[PDB]
Amino acid sequence: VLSEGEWQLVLHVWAKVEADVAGHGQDILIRLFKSHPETLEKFDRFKHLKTEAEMKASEDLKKVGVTALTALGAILKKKGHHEAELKPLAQSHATKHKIPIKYLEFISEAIIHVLHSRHPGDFGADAQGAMNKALELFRKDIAAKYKELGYQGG
Ligand code: HEM
Predict the structure, then answer these.
(1) Residue 65, burial from CB neighbour count under 10 angstroms (0-12, 13-18, 19+)
(2) Which key words tag this protein in UniProt?
(3) Contact call for residues 42 and 97 (beta carbons, < 8 A)
(4) Fewer C-beta within 10 Å: the chain N or C terminus?
(5) In sequence order, what DSSP letters do the residues of 53-92 get, joined into one string?
(6) What is d(CA 98, CA 87) in angstroms, rounded to the nearest whole number?
């Protein structure tokens, strides 16, 4: 789907994420909750975290962020060959957590924002476009899996 050069840009910036998965995951979740506060309602154990500093101090939140970014990294490394990795994620996020596709758009925005904030010299326009395409492919394929399970994801 993406060109080889596009995948290389995606995986180059992902290697920078991997130097500090925990910190990237914290910043991505905090940015998501600040930009789109409705998303915080999906995390029952985070509702007592009232400030950014409380969110950064929560080992629970940090672990959730690492788990999410670890799954996303494993998907990105498949360079589109990710049906086997997406099926359980779709099942879980559609049927258990009830995450609309729009919320996956929101977290994608947060991912792009944090990656550019931390790695501008390794995440210029071409790399941003490549990452946007990779996350778009992720969302398109997961939306198809949602439907297969009986969830439109709207
Ligand atoms: C790049 C997009 C995402 C990835 C790769 C991802 C990945 C994961 C993984 C691997 C887990 C643990 C296994 C599971 O329960 O499925 C998880 C848990 C969870 N996810 Fe996501 N997720 C993403 C986006 C979201 C978004 C946008 C939301 C809500 C707005 C969300 C809500 C949740 C919740 C509520 C849990 C349970 C956490 C817990 O109680 O430990 N996810 N996610």
Answers:
(1) buried
(2) Cytoplasm, Heme, Iron, Metal-binding, Muscle protein, Oxidoreductase, Oxygen transport, Phosphoprotein, Transport
(3) yes
(4) C
(5) HHHHH-HHHHHHHHHHHHHHHHHHHTTT--HHHHHHHHHI
(6) 15
For 55, the token pair is: 């969110």
Which residue is associated with the tokens 């975290």?
A: 49
1 neighbors 80 (Cβ within 8 angstroms): yes
Residue type, 122: D
- Residue 117: which of 54, 50, 52, 23 has the closest Cα? 23
What distance in angstroms lies between residue 43's CA and the mean position of ligand 1's atoms?
9
Counting from 1 in the atom list of ligand 1, the atom nearest the Cα of 42 is: 35
Determination method here?
A: X-ray
User: What's the token pair of residue 12?
Assistant: 């180059």
HSE-up (13 A, CA, CB side) for residue 40: 17
